[PDB]
Design a protein around this nucleic acid. Structure first.
Length: 51
DNA sequence: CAAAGGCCGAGGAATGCGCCCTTTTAGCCTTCTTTTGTCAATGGATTTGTG
């Protein structure tokens, strides 16, 4: 059961690093979208973080 | 052999900005049970009437 939960953890770490790589790639997309809302009351970094 | 121009990117105002749908949450709105304030009786213990 140790090795079972271990292989589970291996899969989880792989998928998590993959999600990380995708988010890292598309941060530029998020900034490009958030630039459209920059003057409706919320600061720029807050827009980027919600995005 | 350089110049004009076509291309891409790095930076800003703003006439800029969701919709349709499911599901919970607030609160108002009625209906009912109970605590509470009220009107009337109904004697009963001092106050007065009497000589």
């Amino acid at each position: 059961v140790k090795d079972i939960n271990r292989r589970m953890s291996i899969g989880e770490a792989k998928a998590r690093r993959a999600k990380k790589e995708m988010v890292e790639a598309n941060l530029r997309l998020v900034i490009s979208i958030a630039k459209k809302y920059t003057n409706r009351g919320l600061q720029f970094l807050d827009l980027i973080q919600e995005g």
